[PDB]
Structure formats: C-alpha cells, structure tokens
C-alpha cells in the first residue's frame, strides 16, 4: 500500500542524509583562510544604450564579443553594436509579453518566447534586407522562461508547466521531455561541452539532466523559497544559485552538497540575476534594491558595488573574452561597465 | 527707495523712513535665499529627470529663480546711482535691463499656470518634448525683448523714458511707459487666480482643511498672487497698509520660494537629507 | 527541505474538544506568516484562521469566530489551534500552511491544488 | 498516492547509490582553477588603455 | 570614416526614424487587466464590450470617444499566480469581477482581494470592482431558503447607511443585503491603504450596456490624481 512506500521513502531519505554527513571532513572557509583578498573593485560606465520604451526583461551576448541582443515589453527585439553604439536590427514581435532571448553560436539565428506558450525563431541572413520568422514551436502548456541554442537545429526550452523539452527545428517536434519538478522552472545553463545541464525551480530544488538518455541524475536542496537564477562554473563542476530569501549558495556535482552561502544582515530582498566571470574569482549578482553586488567566490565577502539604476535590475551578462559587463533594468536602459 | 515705486506713480513722504529699511533688508534675504535654491538645483539634477512633466516643471522653476535674482541685483544697482551729476550713462542701461528681466519672470509664471490646466482639462492628449521646449522658450524670452525694444525706441528720442529723480520709468501728462509694465504684469495674476480655483474644486471632494491649506500655501509664491496688492497702490495714497503690506509680502518672494516651494517637497527633502547624512 | 508535521487528531462527540499541533523544520520560524486549512469530505480547500509574524494580528473565518483559538510559540517552533464546542460539520483533514516569501503581508497560493509548503495533514471526526 | 510514492521510491533508489568524494578534494580543484587562469581575467587585473576597446 | 562606417551610420539613423513613429502609437493606447473566478460572468462583459470594437493570453480592443483601450484575459495557465502577475505593474487599472449571489464562496473572493491589495509590485494600481449578478440576489433573498446571517454573524447588527439611494423601488431587505457586502470590501480597501491608490464599486447585471463608460470615467479620475500628486498638491 501507500504506507509501505512512504516508509521506504523516509528510510531512503534518512540513508541519503547519513551518507551525505560523512563526506564532509572540512569546511571551505577554513581551507580558504590564507587566500589573499582581491581588494576593492571600482567600475564605471562606458556606454549607455537608449531606445526602449518599457521594461527590459532579458539580454544575451554573441560569440563575437561585439554584438548584443535585448528584449523589452513593448514588442521589440534590438541588436546592438556596443563598440560604437549603433543599431543593426530592430525586429517587431507579435505578442508584447516576452520573457527570454538568445543568439546561436553561428551568428545566424535568434529566438524568443513569453507568456503565449510559443518559441519563435528568426533568420538573420536572408537575401533581402528584411528579417522574417523561420519557425514557431508550440506544444507547451505554460509560459516559457528560458531558452538556449545547442546547434542551428536543436533547442532546449523550459516552461511553467513543470517540464523541460528538447526541440528539433526543421521537423518541428519534441524528441525528449524531462519531467520531475513539482513547481515552475525558472532558469537553465548548458554545459561547456553541451552534454548535461541544470535547472532550478520555484521550490527549493535543483536538478541535473542528460540530454541523450533523458533522465534525472542528481537533486540538490537547501534553500527556503523560490530559486530565481542559475549558472555554471567554467569547468562544469560547480554551479551557483540565488533565491528569493536574500541568499546565494554554491553547489558541487560530486560532493552533492553546499560549500558556501552568501548573505548579510542588512540585505532583506531577493536576487534576480547571477553570473560568473572568466576565472571564477568574481560572482556578480542583481537585486531589487536597486543595486548590483560583486562577491568574492572563495571567501564570501563583498568586494564591490555597482549603482546607477533607478529601478529593479533584471538581467546581467559577461563576455566570452572577459572585457565588459552588461546590465539592464526596469528603467529602460542598458549600461556597460569595464 | 521704496519697493512700491514699481507700481506707484507717487510715494507719500510720511511713511518714508518706515518702508525704506524693509526693502534694504527684504531683498537681502531674497538674494541669499535664491542662491541656495540654485545650489540645490545643481546638486541633484541627475536624480530628478524621470518623466516629461517633472522635467518641464523643473525648467520653469529654475528660469523663475534666475530671472528674479538678476532683476533684484539690477534694482539694487539702479537705486544707488546719483543722477544729480550725470544726466545719462548707466541710468538708462540699468532701467532697460530691470524692465526686461521682470517681465520675463511674469511670463514664465504664466507658463506654469497653463501647464496645470493642460493636465486637467485635456486628459488624453500627448505632445513631443522639444516642441514644448520651443514654445516655452519662445514665449518666455520672446515677448520681453519685443516690448522692451519698442518702448525704448519709441520713447528715448524726446527724453521721456527716465524719471527726473530716480532710475525707473515715469509718467507726467505725456508719455507713460510705466503702463508697459503694469498692464502685462497684473493681467497674468488675474489668470493664475482662475487656475487656483480649479485645483480647489478637485481637492474638496469629500483632514480636508489641512489638505486644502497645504495646497494653497504652495501655489501663492510660485504663481505670484501677492503682487495683486499693487492694484491699490496705483489708486490710493496711504489709507491703511497698501504701501507697507506690498513690501513685506512681495520683497520676500525668494524667501517664500525657498521655504515652501522647495524645502517642503517630499522627494527633494529626502534626497537632500540623505546626501547630507 | 521544508518539513511541517501535524499531530492531535481523533474522534470526538458533539460538543467536545481537542488540540492541534504543527511542528516545523527547515527555516527561520519567526519571519513567516502562518495559516490553517481544511478539506471537507466532498469539497475543495477552505480557509480557517490566520496569525502574523509577531503574534498581535489575528483573523478568523465567519463560522469559527466564537469557538476556535489560534496561537504560536516561536521558541519551540510550534503552531496551535484549540476547539471547544464541535458540530458534525467540522469533520475534515487539517493542514498547516506557510507563505512563499519572508518579510511580507500578502499571502499567495495557500489553497491551491498543488503547493510545496504544506503538511500532510490529520483527520478529525466528530460524531 | 500509490503511483506518486512508487515513483519517489524508484527515483530515490537511483539517487541513493551514486559514488561520492570528500569535500576537501572538491574545494582544492576550485581553488587551483582560479590560480591557473588568474593572469588572463581582465576584471581582476585591468589592462592598459591602449588595448581596451571600450575606453580607447 | 570609410564607406562601411558611413553606411552603418545611415542605417542607424534610418532605424531611429522608425522608432520615433513607434513611440507615438505605443503611447496612445491604454492597457487593462481583467480578473475573476470561474462562476463570475467574466466573459459576458467581454462580449458586451466587444460591441464597441492552447493560447496563453487573449486580447480585446474597444474604443470610447476616440480613445483606444486594450483588455487582457489570461488562459491556459495553472492556478499559481505569483510569478506572471509581476508583468502587469504598468497598467492603468485592474478590473475585478465578483459573484455576489453565492454566499458559500464570498470569503474566498475577499481573501483573493486582500492579496492583490497588499502585494509589493501592485501598490500603485487601482481597482474597479464589479459586483455581478444582482438579479439573482433579489430572488435568493426574498424566497427565504438561505440565511445570510448563518455565514456572517455581524449581519445581525447592521443598519442601512443613510447615504444609500434605493432608486428602483425595491424591498429594503434587498438594499441591506446589497450594501453589506460592499461595506465588507471597502473595509479592506480603506484599512491598509496609504493614499496612493483607490477603489471603485459598482452594481452590475447580465443585461447592462454601460460598462465601457464607467471604465472611461474612472480612468480619467485616476490620471488626474497622478498629475496632481506629481506636483506635491495631494
């Protein structure tokens, strides 16, 4: 009956906790006691990009570290050249409410999604000067939150119906569906080699998957409320998360438990964006405070602040060469720091 | 040097020592106060540029303050110029400048009034920023120039543009240039009055008295309803207070603007105190 | 890992009394608003009683306003409910409920079909 | 329910028999990675203005 | 500047020239959100208002006195609404329709109203409240099968307010019942506010035609308030 199954589940959880206690012989803050602090980090704007009429809700870089893409809630998708502050493309959408965007590593396509439960794909290299829609992907049952390209023919999506999907573009149908969450899913991050990826939910849970087989492998807990952002450490052996309880944490995929927690006593608001740097010695985080904070990752102290936004910060990004940082916010502006 | 000569053809000598000191102290605080005002207007500029209406508002306020300060300093200069020796020279320039600048003040205040009505009577209507800037600057600094140059050109040849005792406009049975100040000044306050009544028919809809009072104690300095007491100085001699309430009400214009129009704001005071702390 | 475990059910005559106790584990207990919910045999999820972060705001549904009493104890991490004169229309299954966020007064998603911060429940029968 | 508990038990079965390593071995790797790539991180070690595209 | 840079600047100017036309059309339209429950008559007012003219969201366009109004109704979603409700923090108003002929569900509606009132990102958004289905309430009260005082004890000690206007010529019991629930809503409206948003109650039925004019007249009042507060007069 259900009683025996629940008792077995409780025993399994107890065994898991017992096996997780005896794997922790040291604390990171003790091994990292002799590390030199990085100093004080001061940054200042170099470009301010204007042109949007409403909130800016997502952004993404390109493999060439010169081009950008930005998405707003008035129905616009803009492609920027950040060196000279030009405008290369402005694409209108069909639904105003958009929540994600992305380049493909080949510099040929973009994609977006939102409240209407569709993912739209746009071609950039037509013979004429006009950009048109190449494909529309339908079949979710809840608002999409994030999407990331793999090749020019494979995409991965996350929705508010508690499921993740893998899509083949030319055919136009799913090849694998990932089920297992209890709440909504909020953020994703693909691996450097593109063989596994991580997802966090509106529960205090996160998971790791396998794109080929199509199954869950490890589950991590520890937070107290919803999980808002997630990303990968450069080597693919860690990931850092932030939650709507004024706390960030760091997780590993072999010890299967926490290693650091970033928080304070004057911080009583949540986290919206999380982004690493090229070496792993900086962790940048966004708040509705309305600031951005720069955390040393190996000692859990603040080493810098970034101010200048009049409203909530929603997005954040770094480049593939390490030269700039781009920040957007609900006040309709993007700012570049170096 | 009574501050009533702006509106007064004649200043009876009886109260002559009564008013004089007031002016020389009144303007004093005014000068000081206005400087502080501009200082604040320079410290928090990047933190107030949020929308269209607030931007146009701040522009009107800074223009008002600047015009008032310069007009005050030129009155001070032109009141201590001895005309018993040189019948020309600075006693024309000063006059002209004072004239021009005061008129500009008045016209700027008119703009503020109009803006309020345009935000209430026409609720669903939208315009561009730069067209509003253009109309504001072309009717703020536009008509003062025209009136000033026409008056000086049509009056200076026959030597009827300056008084025989002090550096200001005159009139005696002939050319009356002083009307080119009174007629355009008074008939702006008899417009702003209307605006105030309108705003009172929107705040008395239902604690109410405090609300109405705090509303009416902010819009009296900026739109300048006090200058209306000059309507009696032109048509009387002394009777009770006309030459003495005028000075104590209108010479502390900058003090009133610094006390009610700036430091009683909610956001600006918070920003000021946060920066100070 | 949020845990909320209930205790104190049973069977009671009409007019009797009993005490419900919820024990919590896995969060700072004093930052969060708390609630009570019940599921009557044949209906949806209802709402009964409320309490605030400190212990100085209290609120009830219409029909339990003279009989049931709510309290919390921040030291022992426990939420309480006492009932005095029971009617047969109180037989149900009883859950405690948290709020999604800390330091807030709005209470979203407590009565939904699926929701992550909500105990397993306890059965109360009156006859 | 029965099916939900069965699925939970089955998943916890795979989740409870996976290899692990100690934490003092999974802190040193992160520690050493940063020192490996510490001279090529512009936001820790700034560059001269002659090679900075956003300032030159 | 070589030819490539010239061409780049020409294209950028040509793009700004079109964004300037997009600004006006975006700014000349107003956005509204529509909320209710499964037994509320939500769609009937939409059908009536369309005279003035799978999927995760719908849209309806109507026009009053050459003013263009957009209305949005959500669909194909789950029952948890604490993440996609953050998208509607720049609308002119929120419309809330409530069924006032089923006494067993009004407590749920009140609890749904409080969470909207006291949310963080919706503290500058006003609400237009429709108390639908006043026809059914008349017969349910007159007939005498259900007792209103059995779901709410305080009804035993209630007197009709003297500012009420029972124009139609009805049985006073109907007026007591009508105004009790509106008082129940306006208590929550008045208690925790801070003078930054308001609430507007109305009595509707399934055969009214005037539901566009009321939204028009209330949106004027909202905008006038915003303009007066931006000058530090209210």
PDB file of C-alpha atoms in Angstrom, chain C residues 3-9 19-24 34-37 78-79 93-98 117-124:
ATOM      1  CA  UNK C   3       9.020  19.970   6.819  1.00  0.00           C
ATOM      2  CA  UNK C   4       5.664  20.558   8.529  1.00  0.00           C
ATOM      3  CA  UNK C   5       4.303  17.674  10.626  1.00  0.00           C
ATOM      4  CA  UNK C   6       0.881  17.696  12.311  1.00  0.00           C
ATOM      5  CA  UNK C   7      -0.493  15.926  15.370  1.00  0.00           C
ATOM      6  CA  UNK C   8      -3.588  15.760  17.544  1.00  0.00           C
ATOM      7  CA  UNK C   9      -6.479  14.172  15.646  1.00  0.00           C
ATOM      8  CA  UNK C  19      -5.878  20.373  20.346  1.00  0.00           C
ATOM      9  CA  UNK C  20      -3.934  20.552  17.067  1.00  0.00           C
ATOM     10  CA  UNK C  21      -0.157  20.969  16.980  1.00  0.00           C
ATOM     11  CA  UNK C  22       2.078  21.699  13.974  1.00  0.00           C
ATOM     12  CA  UNK C  23       5.852  21.280  14.222  1.00  0.00           C
ATOM     13  CA  UNK C  24       8.155  22.927  11.684  1.00  0.00           C
ATOM     14  CA  UNK C  34       1.189  31.021   9.084  1.00  0.00           C
ATOM     15  CA  UNK C  35      -2.311  29.752   8.245  1.00  0.00           C
ATOM     16  CA  UNK C  36      -4.786  26.902   8.780  1.00  0.00           C
ATOM     17  CA  UNK C  37      -6.633  24.954   6.063  1.00  0.00           C
ATOM     18  CA  UNK C  78       5.033  25.135  17.081  1.00  0.00           C
ATOM     19  CA  UNK C  79       1.666  26.394  15.861  1.00  0.00           C
ATOM     20  CA  UNK C  93      -8.480  16.726   7.145  1.00  0.00           C
ATOM     21  CA  UNK C  94      -6.318  19.536   8.508  1.00  0.00           C
ATOM     22  CA  UNK C  95      -3.118  21.103   7.142  1.00  0.00           C
ATOM     23  CA  UNK C  96      -0.906  23.958   8.255  1.00  0.00           C
ATOM     24  CA  UNK C  97       0.408  26.359   5.648  1.00  0.00           C
ATOM     25  CA  UNK C  98       3.352  28.747   5.261  1.00  0.00           C
ATOM     26  CA  UNK C 117       4.962  24.287   1.703  1.00  0.00           C
ATOM     27  CA  UNK C 118       2.102  22.385   3.314  1.00  0.00           C
ATOM     28  CA  UNK C 119       1.949  19.456   5.711  1.00  0.00           C
ATOM     29  CA  UNK C 120       0.492  16.005   5.154  1.00  0.00           C
ATOM     30  CA  UNK C 121      -2.473  16.586   7.466  1.00  0.00           C
ATOM     31  CA  UNK C 122      -4.517  14.976  10.214  1.00  0.00           C
ATOM     32  CA  UNK C 123      -8.064  13.605  10.296  1.00  0.00           C
ATOM     33  CA  UNK C 124     -10.694  14.897  12.732  1.00  0.00           C
TER      34      UNK C 124
END
